[PDB]
Amino acid sequence: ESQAFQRQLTALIGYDVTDVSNVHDDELEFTRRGLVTPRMAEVASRDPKLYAMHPWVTSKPLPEYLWKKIANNCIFIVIHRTTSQTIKVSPDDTPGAILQDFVLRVCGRDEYLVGETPIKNFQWVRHCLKNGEEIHVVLDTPPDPALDEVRKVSLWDCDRKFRVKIRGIDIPVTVFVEANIQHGQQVLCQRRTSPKPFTEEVLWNVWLEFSIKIKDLPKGALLNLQIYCQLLYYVNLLLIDHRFLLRRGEYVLHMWQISFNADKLTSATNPDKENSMSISILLDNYCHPIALPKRAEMPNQLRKQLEAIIATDPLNPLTAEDKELLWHFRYESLKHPKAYPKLFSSVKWGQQEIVAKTYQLLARREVWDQSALDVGLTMQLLDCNFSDENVRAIAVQKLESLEDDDVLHYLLQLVQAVKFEPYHDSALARFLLKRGLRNKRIGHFLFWFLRSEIAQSRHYQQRFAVILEAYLRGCGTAMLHDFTQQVQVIEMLQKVTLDIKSLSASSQVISQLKQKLENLQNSQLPESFRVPYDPGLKAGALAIEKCKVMASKKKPLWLEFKCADPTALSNETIGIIFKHGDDLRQDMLILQILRIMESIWETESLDLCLLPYGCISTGDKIGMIEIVKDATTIAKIQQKDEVLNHWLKEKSPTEEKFQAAVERFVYSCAGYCVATFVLGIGDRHNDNIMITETGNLFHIDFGHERVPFVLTPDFLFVMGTSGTSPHFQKFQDICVKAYLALRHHTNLLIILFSMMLMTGMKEDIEYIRDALTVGKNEEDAKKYFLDQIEVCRDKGWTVQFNWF
Numbered sequence: 139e140s141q142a143f144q145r146q147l148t149a150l151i152g153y154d155v156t157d158v159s160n161v162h163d164d165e166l167e168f169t170r171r172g173l174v175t176p177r178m179a180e181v182a183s184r185d186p187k188l189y190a191m192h193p194w195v196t197s198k199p200l201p202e203y204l205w206k207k208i209a210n211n212c213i214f215i216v217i218h219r220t221t222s223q224t225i226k227v228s229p230d231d232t233p234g235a236i237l238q239d240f241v242l243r244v245c246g247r248d249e250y251l252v253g254e255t256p257i258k259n260f261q262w263v264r265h266c267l268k269n270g271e272e273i274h275v276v277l278d279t280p281p282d283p284a285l286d287e288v289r290k291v292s293l294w295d296c297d298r299k300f301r302v303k304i305r306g307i308d309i310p311v312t313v314f315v316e317a318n319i320q321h322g323q324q325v326l327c328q329r330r331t332s333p334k335p336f337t338e339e340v341l342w343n344v345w346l347e348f349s350i351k352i353k354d355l356p357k358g359a360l361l362n363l364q365i366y367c368q369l370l371y372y373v374n375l376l377l378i379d380h381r382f383l384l385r386r387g388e389y390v391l392h393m394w395q396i397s398f399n400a401d402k403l404t405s406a407t408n409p410d411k412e413n414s415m416s417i418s419i420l421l422d423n424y425c426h427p428i429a430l431p432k433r434a435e436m437p438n439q440l441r442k443q444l445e446a447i448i449a450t451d452p453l454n455p456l457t458a459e460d461k462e463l464l465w466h467f468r469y470e471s472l473k474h475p476k477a478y479p480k481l482f483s484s485v486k487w488g489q490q491e492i493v494a495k496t497y498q499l500l501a502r503r504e505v506w507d508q509s510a511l512d513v514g515l516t517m518q519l520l521d522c523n524f525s526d527e528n529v530r531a532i533a534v535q536k537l538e539s540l541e542d543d544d545v546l547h548y549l550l551q552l553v554q555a556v557k558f559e560p561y562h563d564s565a566l567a568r569f570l571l572k573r574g575l576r577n578k579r580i581g582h583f584l585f586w587f588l589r590s591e592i593a594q595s596r597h598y599q600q601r602f603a604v605i606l607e608a609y610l611r612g613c614g615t616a617m618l619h620d621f622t623q624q625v626q627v628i629e630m631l632q633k634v635t636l637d638i639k640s641l642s643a644s645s646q647v648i649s650q651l652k653q654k655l656e657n658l659q660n661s662q663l664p665e666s667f668r669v670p671y672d673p674g675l676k677a678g679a680l681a682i683e684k685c686k687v688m689a690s691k692k693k694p695l696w697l698e699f700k701c702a703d704p705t706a707l708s709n710e711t712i713g714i715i716f717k718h719g720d721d722l723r724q725d726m727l728i729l730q731i732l733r734i735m736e737s738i739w740e741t742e743s744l745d746l747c748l749l750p751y752g753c754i755s756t757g758d759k760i761g762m763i764e765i766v767k768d769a770t771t772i773a774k775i776q777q778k779d780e781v782l783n784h785w786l787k788e789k790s791p792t793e794e795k796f797q798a799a800v801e802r803f804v805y806s807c808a809g810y811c812v813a814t815f816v817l818g819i820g821d822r823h824n825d826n827i828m829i830t831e832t833g834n835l836f837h838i839d840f841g842h843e844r845v846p847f848v849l850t851p852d853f854l855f856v857m858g859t860s861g862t863s864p865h866f867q868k869f870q871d872i873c874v875k876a877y878l879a880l881r882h883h884t885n886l887l888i889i890l891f892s893m894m895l896m897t898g899m900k901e902d903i904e905y906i907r908d909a910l911t912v913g914k915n916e917e918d919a920k921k922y923f924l925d926q927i928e929v930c931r932d933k934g935w936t937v938q939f940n941w942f
């Protein structure tokens with residue numbers, strides 16, 4: 139009936155936010171209700187014009203390597219109606235000023251050049267300049283903003299010890315309960331139950347007294363119940379609710395099975411009730427409710443100790459001495475923003491009086507608020523080591539600074555950080571909403587990032603579902619319509635990939651694909667859909683005759699689409715790869731880190747010509763990859779040392795284009811060598827590395843006696859020298875420049891890598907430290923890296939062959 143909006147939202151999300159068949163409290167529903175305000179606040183605040191236009195812009199400097207490209211110091215763009223005309227431009231002009239009511243859209247795309255910013259501060263332009271491409275725009279009338287229409291007693295009075303009664307466990311399918319009280323990844327106190335028998339049901343029926351006072355439990359403390367022989371089952375219960383009240387009564391909680399990890403922190407209970415292990419518990423019964431309420435100077439030698447502590451990397455563990463040092467001199471420690479994580483990892487959270495001091499400490503926010511924004515520092519406070527909302531808010535507040543440009547750089551990482559949140563409604567979840575709804579680009583990518591996790595993760599789908607719904611309710615009639623079209627297409631194509639995969643371990647199946655695709659274009663269809671990994675591009679009908687299946691053991695589709703925009707100045711298709719077997723969420727992260735690195739280099743005016751191709755995880759074990767045109771694997775070129783350069787000349791028609799090719803190869807090869815080493819995904823099989831008919835090398839298939847990174851003799855033959863040329867010198871030089879360019883952001887990468895490991899996949903994270911060579915001077919770094927280069931040369935073709 140009138141509720142003709144909900145089951146729409148539901149099938150977009152892939153989950154239901156009205157469903158209560160798995161909640162044991164109203165936090166999810168409360169957070170649906172709570173999100174209405176910041177939603178309205180952002181919907182109502184956003185300028186309908188610039189929103190419908192979503193101009194993708196930056197405030198960053200136009201880099202030195204791009205400065206060379208600029209004509210005289212003029213720049214040419216062509217306007218179109220059929221008929222066209224060229225215009226000379228100054229790099230500081232405005233769209234409306236160059237215009238001399240009507241708007242400028244980029245040809246073949248849903249992308250606009252509008253608003254009060256210079257043209258040099260447009261992303262498309264900077265792309266066109268980087269690639270050497272021409273800038274093509276059509277005179278068009280601004281899209282109607284009406285299309286975007288938006289539808290419509292104290293706890294510190296309780297001095298008794300905290301107590302939890304374990305009734306017992308049951309499973310329908312040397313075993314004891316392990317009851318921890320946690321704040322972050324920190325264990326406050328820990329009791330246990332007597333080791334009992336192996337029966338599918340065991341009832342201990344004992345009260346357990348914890349050494350912590352009721353008063354001393356901190357907001358966001360977790361009753362973490364574990365089952366050992368040894369660890370096989372875990373479940374968590376926020377001991378304090380979303381209304382600040384201490385929890386009460388009896389609970390039956392179904393538990394996740396094992397086989398450190400962001401899942402282990404989830405307040406979500408297992409929905410599969412008929413198979414999962416459970417537990418019954420009793421919480422201290424009371425009649426009236428319990429709600430939680432709301433210098434001399436330093437000697438030198440100690441300052442030096444403190445300043446060393448502050449200077450260390452994120453992964454350097456703090457001794458108890460360090461912690462005590464940081465604490466006792468908290469007011470001086472406050473003066474340094476870099477001391478914050480280590481300072482808040484120094485507070486005893488299981489102590490009411492201490493937590494207070496911290497809260498009154500955070501009131502003196504003078505210097506933090508004043509400090510220049512540090513994404514690395516900011517990210518540190520959003521990780522699994524911080525479970526206090528006030529600590530987490532001072533981080534979130536710093537993010538507000540970021541221009542949409544930089545949000546899109548950290549979106550995935552930020553979305554994944556929601557997993558470390560203790561409450562469904564948080565400053566960070568809230569921030570993502572705000573930022574998503576204020577900018578269509580972010581909101582498109584938010585949708586997918588969120589939907590990726592919902593379809594694939596039982597530990598966090600409820601949390602992400604309520605946040606997705608929150609976004610959708612303010613994104614507009616326009617985007618709601620597009621998301622539906624996109625959802626339909628992938629919900630069609632994935633089934634097609636599955637059915638096909640089972641029909642093989644040949645040219646028999648290749649005609650079965652085309653036959654199965656034909657009826658999909660006729661019945662159930664959408665003529666056009668937005669490309670999930672590149673929303674500027676609108677795909678049309680399948681180039682049915684161009685589609686195939688691929689020569690891998692995992693069977694991916696090779697698909698070709700027409701462009702639905704008739705104003706596109708090319709006839710070239712849009713390629714996509716549908717794949718089952720490798721988890722694409724791991725690919726997404728790495729590609730995203732790759733973009734971050736490319737932005738890092740930009741700050742040092744370096745370009746390394748990476749190809750971080752589009753890649754969106756869509757559902758369990760399955761998703762899409764962007765097709766890079768004119769590219770081939772290195773292994774196929776081999777089907778040893780001489781052939782690589784010949785292929786390049788074979789594909790390069792002239793000598794300029796061949797010198798442009800080898801120019802391109804050196805940068806891109808250098809780039810991937812640095813990146814892959816830092817990430818520790820260096821040693822890869824030759825079938826997983828590719829190159830374009832133009833020089834650009836690039837890695838693929840990020841699915842997990844070794845070489846630090848793949849630099850081989852055939853690559854070296856193109857560069858010259860037998861196992862130093864004028865090109866091997868450049869390679870060497872730019873690798874050291876690229877390697878040191880990362881080391882200036884040691885902290886940032888450490889935390890991202892650490893975050894990557896916890897949400898995507900201690901001695902595991904420790905690797906990035908060594909790879910970036912922490913604690914060594916710039917000289918030692920150049921040495922360290924060039925030695926790695928030498929290993930690859932000295933080992934030649936060894937490990938390649940080894941893969942039998």
Ligand SMILES: C[C@@H](c1nc(-c2cnc(N)c(-n3nnc4ccccc43)n2)nn1C)N1CCOCC1
Nearest residue numbers: 688715751763764765766767769770771774838839
């Ligand atoms: C089929 C043909 C080909 N593949 C591509 C191409 C393009 N873009 C990509 N992103 C891409 N990636 N990326 N991730 C992948 C994951 C798996 C497979 C492929 C992948 N592959 N282009 N071409 C012409 N290969 C020619 C060389 O011999 C092997 C077959």
